[PDB]
Ligand binder design. Structure first.
Ligand code: HEM
Ligand code: HEM
Ligand code: HEM
Lengths: 677, 455, 678
């Protein structure tokens, strides 16, 4: 059990009497009053201790990535990687290390929607036997800006307008696009966010990246530059925007529930930990500077090496205590890893330590159960708010004769201490500049865009069309077009259409036709359909439900999560039409006989909103899902103008339908249903 | 201009050079580095002062009603209501008092959708010439529970399940309906939340209620029981659920934008302030106990008497500084108003003062611009986190020869002091019970249901 | 071991490599730099995690009682007291309960001196099997004020002036005496603070009091009014002011070191827990209201009944984590005890819960190891800053079908729940007043003063003379005399002399001659002299040291702590004259041969300040200590004009000196050396 060490702080209240927080049994359902209809007494200590604790439940949300969810798991090394790193967790084949991972959006506050369009966080902690190592990554391999000092500018522009605090969890407003166009470095991450990466199907269907070049260091100090990659074993999958919007309202918790359900059902998600490794002398050899976090290294130049695998197989017991409280830091580093001079990374090291003071209101947050390492803490730190330990060593300083030299110094050669890469040097004048090697802001956005499929490119264009059409200031829109045109004249022209503007003339300085693999989502079918969801539209009339029950049983053989829907909760019904929406499902199937709820009176019961069954099938179809109907249910498909000869539409006998749907779920999204310019 | 008093703390950055928080002009777009492709230096004080402030931007959201929006405005009294209250803001025809109002949902966190189905907050501050008076109300006249000690139970049951933090901003889950059925008092507010009140068209289309019975007290100490009502001049309007759900994704900011736009376009919304006034001897006259916040008083027994009108005509300049930071309290009471032994109200008085300590991390939150009264603060309180003033009086205690008796005691007869209703008495045993008069949990939910149209 | 439960949070660093707070071995003696003489790098995560922790070590001090120290121990019940209380910790003979006690002054900030003149705190936690029960008491049985709402007034007036923050740890300034005279309720506690209780010899030599009348309640709801008393087994003992002042500079840690030493030496201090028990119908029977905390109940009307004994026998391992962080509350009450309508107590209940939010910056302070009960916490509280547990019950509300009704309600009849005294009632109008039964502010101050010995009375007068002479405002001084006159014309007159004023004429309204037992310090000898300290003045020249060593060995036989003092740290020498002062010792003895440092060449060593040995002996005598000299050392006594015939002065052979000093130490202070008016 990955949560094993947490058991000692778990509290079971089953079969117990209520107590105060200082012990003593109580009742706490009535205030103490002076007389039958009297005022409450100040001496009611029970009332105040209970309400005081309630009154103080909330802590500040994270300044960014406030909306997220996590789980525990295990990382397993595939090898002894000592030839590239001294890092203990990678030091032996089959070696296992507990992890916790939190996934998130970026802009939105605590209770914003999972299916907002946004960059996504993917933060992993390895509780190694040599200290906590965090890879604090995102589901997109490049970041908006080149120097950490600019982070508040970026974040301020994307988050809601400070006068009215609108809009929530959205880049679709003037200030954000003002920043994107005023700080062109932002254009690369912007294109990624406007792609499927901005609206993933689930946390499980995302890759993750460290973004920065880091260093792996061996015992003797030999270093390699490294990029961290998480490769999902579930496959990348993304929604379409018009779908993600309805899902934001129908189920704000879509991703956190998806993760929770997969773990609880025994379908633990996995990712392989992979790296690209680069010689120090080639830091600037691939057409860009590897210290620049707005660029990625095409895998054609440096293929992925697979170090191991992570599986997330245990949900938290208390969300607040575990998921809300956990404090990630890129500064959480261990022997065998080092930083690079990436000016974005450099500032994060400061920011994440400091911000913990805000969120946890004290310096002892590393003592919280979820933050504690498993490898022992021995130093001369004392006191601070909430000090949870009692230190035995009264000579809390070094050097010292009186403590016999303990705790002792550890370094490269003694006691497996952390050490900075020995080869690293400083050279030149102290400066507040950025290297001219960081200057190209357009080539890689173009590379990315080139490497998408035609419809996938259309999705990016339509995302930009949607977003920029929200910008009220005309010049900002023009500014955006000018910047887009430096990436691609075609992109700029197609966006300009929506905005009713003329796109500038071609500016070919950065234009090119290069492509790179591995950045697309829709070019590849899923490796497994386990956990995917099928909504079966049925009815309480006739024999439909029995047939739906049969269909469900068969589909479940394939590891599918099946929901039978009907007018009301009859035997075998999982959900009512009233509670149902296409957004909850990856496929929609109409069970034989349910065609009766697709027209006339049958479609207008007081039990659900008018047209609900038709709307679900229509949404399912329009959003590119595998849709189907069994036997006479083909009439439901006919009623919404759909034909069984279309890709991802299935009709006929039950066996046929089950096979078709299961195939279509691998394809996942049927892109023939989306018009291209 | 209702925001007039806030002008002195407004900061204009037009045409100005960038500075640190301690002054001195700077640039802050590049970290200081040790060489061209070098590491960032610890001595970059500019970087650290800028990021430290960013790193520390957030404060805890409100434990309830975390999602909401507000506006400034003016309340105008329609008369000299001295025959019913000593309250200064109601003391003269056409007398004007600045207000701030925050509207909200209840369950959801700060970024949740405006169009979730929920009870809605409707909280008003009158910045009176005799201190801040808050009516911290909702858009529904009755509350779920009868004793404040049960508030954490209600709220826990309604908020997200504590294992997975699902679902957001919704009563549609096991724990909430377990509580509602286990604690039947909750059925009345439940029926209201399941009606159009649960999904209003806009804040501007809501009525408001103080819920509890309070007291209006004249100079001589005579009291009347009172229910506070806000009547929307825009009329009540509600969405349908299937619509509210879609809107929650398409525009989570529907209500806050609606209010912002109405004010910006010069369509300032208004509400009349109205009271129901009941003699003390009729507290238990109408088939229920007026101390019981799960019941409302049918207008057939006591018509709504209009006292004045409030119009919200100024948006905030900075949402965080004004709307996020404002700290309402039912304990914000002034001479001419008093509490009653409503056991729900009673506990609120404690919780709202206490909770400010969490949200503002210090005792001096009333010194924040949006929290300051207009009428002057003179007492022997000193120090505390973030103390923003410098007190002249070195004899910060009473009684005292050395300070000549100032600041001076004020009471019913001298200095327009607050005073508890003189005739209130206590009698009976100290108890952890509720009155048998509170026992009917079903009659009013039925009354409410009966009084709606078929659809 | 009273500290047993705390072992699981103890951290041993011996034999270990240094680490960060998130694990991983490190070195942390050099900042990471860009080049040999280069700037420090922001990427130095080691430097930052180390300095951030340091930077944030401090937490607000207690708003009152900031200066203090504590220790762990065991309370043992002498009986099954179920006939008077349902309280489990008192439910059986020989039943043992861990305790922690913190003692303190009141006004001074952290770092202020132990021997300031002040009221002292005496706060005891019983970690009972039915929750934490605190008796948050003082070493004086009455308080300054009658209603909690006036606490900030009292405290502001006593603490430093708010313009310059002067004076530290003292009531000797205008605002304090302005308050005492403007708010006459204060006069009673003032008299106690002006007596020996204001300057105790140590924490171990104090009695303790709950002050408030509380209630004891039996299982069947029957109640008794109660006063809590702690009676010191070491005996009460006080310093003299002129000594306390020097000691405040010479060793600000006098009391905290004393407690620590007593425990480490295996001389754990003990106190008996005693109660006064009176029926509800006695609340107003004794000429005052038992709800009034400015009055004590004379033992002549209700004798002390001993319930058990607590012994403090374990020092803390980390002062901050244990002593600094512990959070006492009078609202920490358990089944079998209840509050009374004491309006001072009533408001404390609010204040102590609220103040923890300031000091601990979050709502989960009861989770700190020192605050945790031993008896189990099961409720629906969740979250909050620094939540240290992981709750298993996902249905964190009541009532509930889903949690099967757990955690369950406990009351008087089910589950040993707390319950308010069943008979308590409220009658009358809501009011912002005080009972007229609280109106007499002078009778008990007079009763107290009456009950002290003549010299003891003089100390009170001299303390007032000292304090009031610091008041710059003429009218405040007159106001003080007018109020004093209402207690005793004689007191007022004797004080007035020092202030160069004319005391008002007699105002006999409250005058009386009654006396009561148990309030005097100097009217009784000490029950034991164990742990008391003897400074032996010696010299490295001649044979003095060998004799001093012999003297030391004999004295230590009687449980005394002996310090041999000489010019330098020779073999056998515990302390240098440079480092020594009479304030450190309960007795001063010149070893034979040491007269050589009292005059002549031996007295002019550059190794100590001029006159140092003579001063120690002079201070010891004038401060009323037993003083002695062995053999020829009597010349030392002669050098300072002191004569052998005097009480508490001893000379002759070693055997005789030891005998007399040991008997003198029981008397402790020789009051014949202090002049009395007239
Ligand atoms: C490669 C670029 C970046 C990546 C991949 C990234 C990723 C993340 C992630 C995944 C989290 C959420 C961790 C969690 O789930 O709790 C987070 C939080 C945070 N990030 Fe970043 N971020 C980047 C850039 C920055 C920069 C430049 C700054 C400021 C200099 C910054 C400051 C913060 C802060 C203050 C938090 C809140 C941490 C907390 O409250 O625990 N980030 N970031
Ligand atoms: C008639 C019953 C109630 C009504 C009408 C009501 C109304 C409100 C409103 C409108 C707000 C948000 C104020 C704002 O916009 O900032 C609020 C917040 C709050 N309520 Fe209540 N509430 C009720 C019951 C209770 C009870 C019984 C408690 C606890 C005993 C309570 C505790 C709180 C707390 C701690 C806040 C957050 C205040 C802050 O952080 O500034 N409420 N309530
Ligand atoms: C009989 C009257 C009183 C007694 C015997 C008393 C005793 C004490 C003692 C012994 C302490 C120190 C506890 C420790 O060692 O940590 C203390 C602290 C304190 N007292 Fe009192 N006091 C009295 C009156 C009051 C009143 C009337 C108030 C306010 C209404 C008050 C408020 C406080 C506060 C806020 C602290 C700080 C507690 C902490 O920070 O943990 N006291 N008192």
């Amino acid at each position: 059990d990955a949560r094993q060490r947490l058991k000692e702080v778990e509290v079971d209240d089953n079969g117990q009497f209520m107590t105060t927080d200082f012990g003593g049994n109580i009742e706490e359902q009535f205030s103490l009053k002076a007389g039958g209809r009297g005022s409450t007494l100040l001496e009611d200590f029970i009332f105040r201790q209970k309400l005081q604790h309630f009154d103080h439940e909330r802590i500040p949300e994270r300044v960014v990535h406030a909306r997220g969810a996590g789980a525990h798991g295990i990382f397993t090394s595939y090898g002894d990687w000592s030839n590239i790193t001294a890092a203990s967790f990678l030091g032996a084949k089959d070696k296992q290390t507990p992890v916790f991972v939190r996934f998130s959006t970026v802009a939105g506050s605590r209770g914003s929607a999972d299916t907002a369009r946004d960059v996504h966080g993917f933060a992993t902690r390895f509780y190694t036997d040599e200290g906590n190592f965090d890879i604090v990554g995102n589901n997109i391999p490049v970041f908006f800006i080149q120097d950490a000092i600019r982070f508040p500018d970026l974040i301020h522009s994307v988050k809601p307008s400070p006068d009215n605090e609108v809009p929530q969890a959205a880049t679709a407003h003037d200030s954000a696009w003002d920043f994107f166009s005023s700080q062109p470095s932002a254009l690369h991450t912007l294109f990624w966010a406007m792609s499927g990466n901005g609206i993933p199907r689930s946390y499980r269907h995302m890759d993750g990246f460290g973004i920065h070049t880091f260093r792996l260091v061996t015992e003797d100090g030999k270093s390699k530059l490294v990029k961290w990659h998480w490769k999902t074993k579930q496959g990348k999958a993304a929604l379409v925007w018009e779908e993600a919007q309805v899902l934001a309202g129908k189920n704000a918790d879509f991703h956190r529930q998806d993760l929770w359900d997969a773990i609880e059902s025994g379908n633990a998600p996995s990712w392989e930990l992979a790296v690209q490794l680069i010689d120090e002398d080639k830091a600037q050899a691939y057409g860009f500077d590897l210290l620049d976090p707005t660029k990625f290294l095409p895998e054609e130049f440096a293929p992925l090496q697979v170090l191991g695998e992570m599986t997330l197989n245990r949900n938290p017991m208390n969300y607040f205590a575990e998921t809300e409280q956990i404090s990630f830091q890129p500064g959480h580093i261990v022997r065998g890893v080092d930083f690079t001079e990436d000016p974005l990374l450099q500032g994060r090291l400061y920011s994440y330590l400091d911000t913990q003071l805000n969120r946890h209101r004290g310096p002892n947050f590393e003592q919280l159960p979820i933050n504690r390492p498993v490898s022992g803490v021995h130093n001369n730190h004392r006191d601070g708010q909430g000090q949870a330990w009692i230190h035995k060593n009264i000579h809390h300083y070094s050097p010292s004769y009186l403590n016999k030299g303990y705790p002792a110094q550890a370094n490269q050669t003694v006691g497996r201490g952390f050490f900075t890469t020995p080869g690293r040097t400083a050279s030149g004048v102290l400066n507040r500049e950025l290297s001219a090697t960081f200057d190209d802001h357009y080539t890689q956005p173009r590379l990315f865009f080139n490497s998408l499929t035609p419809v996938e490119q259309q999705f990016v264009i339509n995302a930009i069309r949607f977003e920029a059409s929200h910008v009220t200031n005309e010049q900002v829109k023009k500014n955006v077009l000018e910047q887009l045109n430096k990436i691609s004249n075609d992109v700029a022209k197609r966006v300009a259409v929506a905005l009713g503007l003329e796109a500038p003339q071609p500016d070919p300085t950065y234009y090119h036709n290069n492509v790179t693999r591995g950045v697309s989502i829709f070019n590849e079918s899923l490796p497994t359909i386990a956990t995917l969801r099928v909504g079966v539209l049925s009815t309480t009339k006739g024999g439909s439900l029995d047939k739906a029950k049969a269909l469900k049983e068969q589909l479940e053989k394939d590891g599918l999560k099946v929901t039978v829907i009907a007018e009301y909760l009859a035997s075998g019904v999982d959900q009512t039409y009233s509670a149902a929406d296409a957004t909850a499902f990856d496929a929609v199937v109409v069970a034989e006989g349910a065609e009766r709820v697709f027209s006339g009176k049958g479609a207008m019961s007081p039990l659900f909103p008018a047209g609900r069954p038709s709307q679900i099938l229509t949404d399912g179809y329009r959003w590119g899902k595998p849709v189907a109907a069994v036997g006479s249910a083909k009439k439901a498909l006919q009623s919404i103008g759909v034909e069984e000869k279309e890709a991802g539409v299935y009709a006929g006998a039950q066996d046929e339908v089950i096979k078709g749907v299961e195939e279509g779920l691998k394809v996942f999204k049927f892109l023939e249903r989306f018009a291209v310019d």
